[PDB]
C-alpha cells in the first residue's frame, strides 16, 4: 500500500540489527502496533547484500504459519529500507534463556515441536532459513515460538555463502552445496542449547568452533536424559542425508512424551 515513514509513530528500539535497528511502531490510522526493521542503504551497499534483502522480503512475505513471524510489507526513502513486521511482545528465546539459564524438558520439547512445524511448512516451499538461532526466535502473546529473521533465507538447493558459526552445519561452514537439511542440524544445536544453556560447539574463537563442527566434536553434561541425547545425536550428523525428516523429529518418543 506504498507506505511512508509519516504513517507511523516510532517507539523504543526492540533490538539491534546487523544493518540497522528494529523499533516498536504504531500505524497512525488503525493504531496497529508492529515492529519496523530499519536498514541503512549505505551499509547494505558496502556489504553488497542488497539482492539478499530482497530475498528476505520475497520469501518471508509469502509465508503464512502461526509459528512464523509475519512481514506485512516494506518501503524505503533516500537512506533507509523499512520492513513492516508483526510485533512479538514476549521478546526473544535468547533473552528467556539468559534469565532461566536452561529450559526444562517440557519447555524444550514444546519449542522443538513449534520449530519443526514452522520448518516443515518452510521446507515444503523448498525454503531454507539457514539462520535458526535463539536471537531469531521470537515469542507471541501466548508464549508461542515464532521463527523470524529471514535475512539469510534461500531456496534449496543453494551453493551461496553468508556472527558466530555456532548454528551452522559442516556443509555451510565449508562453502559447499546445501539443502533443507541445514535447518535439521540447527534444530539439533538448539535442542542442546535449550537443555544445556550453551550451544554444543561453543568456543572462544571462530577457528575452534569451525574444528568442533567439522569433527562433530561435542559432549553432553550428565543431567541430559537418554531420550534427549538420542534426538540431538540423530540431528547432529556430519552427513546431511543421515539427518532425519521433520516428521521423524515430531514423532520422536522424547518429543511426544514431553511436548506440550
Ligand X SMILES: O=C(O)[C@@H]1CCCC[C@H]1C(=O)O
Ligand Y SMILES: Nc1ncnc2c1ncn2[C@@H]1O[C@H](COP(=O)(O)OP(=O)(O)O)[C@@H](O)[C@H]1O
Ligand Z SMILES: Cc1c(C(=O)NS(=O)(=O)C2CC2)cc(-c2ccc(Cl)c(Oc3ccccn3)c2)c2cc[nH]c12
Which grid cell is 151? 535475512
Residue closer to ligand X, measured from CB, 129 or 252: 129
Residue numbers of the site for ligand X (CB under 6 A)?
Answer: 17-19, 39, 49, 52-53, 56, 149, 151-152
In angstroms, what CA-CA distances link 97 with 94, 237, 239? Answer: 5, 25, 29
**Residue span 43-72 as binding mask against ligand Z, x where in contact by CB under 6 A, dash where not:** -xx----x--xx--x---------------
To the query of whether residue 131 is one of the catalytic residues in this protein, the response is yes
Residue 135 labeled ligand binder = yes
CA-nearest of 149, 168, 157, 113 to 39 is 149
Q: What is the dihedral of CA 135, 65, 32, 26, to 10 degrees?
A: 20
Direct distance between the N- and C-terminal alpha carbons of the chain, in angstroms, rounded to an integer: 39
Selection from ligand Z, Mg ion, ligand Y, none that 87 binds (CB < 5 to 8 A by kind) is ligand Y
- Using CB under 6 A, count the residues that bind ligand Y: 20
DSSP state of 244: P
Which grid cell is 93? 528465546
Selection from ligand Z, Mg ion, ligand X, none that 19 binds (CB < 5 to 8 A by kind) is ligand X
Residue closer to ligand Y, measured from CB, 141 or 241: 141
For residues 149 and 55, the answer to whether their CB atoms sit within 8 Å is no
Residue of 138, 190, 213, 236 interacting with ligand Y (CB under 6 A): 138
For residue 155, the cross-strand partners are 127
Residue 87 labeled ligand binder = yes
Which residues, in sequence order, are CB contacts of 175 under 8 Å at separation 6+? 159, 161
Catalytic residue among 77, 104, 131, 179: 131
**Which listed range, 80-88, 96-104, 154-162, 220-228, lies at the site for ligand Y (CB under 6 A)?**
80-88
Binding site for Mg ion (CB under 5 A): 136, 149, 151
Residues annotated as binding site for ATP?
18, 37, 86-88, 135-136, 149
The catalytic site residues sit at: 131
Amino acid at each position: 500500500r506504498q507506505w511512508a515513514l509519516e504513517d507511523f509513530e516510532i517507539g523504543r528500539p526492540l533490538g539491534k540489527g546487523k544493518f540497522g535497528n528494529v523499533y516498536l511502531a504504531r500505524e497512525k490510522q488503525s493504531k496497529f502496533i508492529l515492529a519496523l526493521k530499519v536498514l541503512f542503504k549505505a551499509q547494505l551497499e558496502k556489504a553488497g547484500v542488497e539482492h539478499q534483502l530482497r530475498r528476505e522480503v520475497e520469501i518471508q512475505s509469502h509465508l503464512r504459519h502461526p509459528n512464523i513471524l509475519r512481514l506485512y510489507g516494506y518501503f524505503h526513502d533516500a537512506t533507509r529500507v523499512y520492513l513492516i513486521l508483526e510485533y512479538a511482545p514476549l521478546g526473544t528465546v535468547y533473552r528467556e534463556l539468559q534469565k532461566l539459564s536452561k529450559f526444562d524438558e517440557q519447555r524444550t520439547a514444546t519449542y522443538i515441536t513449534e520449530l519443526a512445524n514452522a520448518l516443515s511448512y518452510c521446507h515444503s516451499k523448498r525454503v531454507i532459513h539457514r539462520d535458526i538461532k535463539p536471537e531469531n526466535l521470537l515469542l507471541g502473546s501466548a508464549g508461542e515460538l515464532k521463527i523470524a529473521d529471514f535475512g539469510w533465507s534461500v531456496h534449496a538447493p543453494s551453493s551461496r555463502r553468508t556472527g558466530t558459526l555456532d548454528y551452522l552445519p559442516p556443509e555451510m561452514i565449508e562453502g559447499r552445496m546445501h539443502d533443507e537439511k541445514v535447518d535439521l542440524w540447527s534444530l539439533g544445536v538448539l535442542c542442546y542449547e535449550f537443555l544445556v544453556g550453551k550451544p554444543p560447539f561453543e568456543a572462544n574463537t571462530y577457528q575452534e568452533t569451525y574444528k568442533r563442527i567439522s569433527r562433530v566434536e561435542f559432549t553432553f553434561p550428565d543431567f541430559v536424559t537418554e531420550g534427549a541425547r538420542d534426538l540431538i545425536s540423530r540431528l547432529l550428523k556430519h552427513n546431511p542425508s543421515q539427518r532425519p525428516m521433520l516428521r521423524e523429529v515430531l514423532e520422536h518418543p522424547w518429543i511426544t512424551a514431553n511436548s506440550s
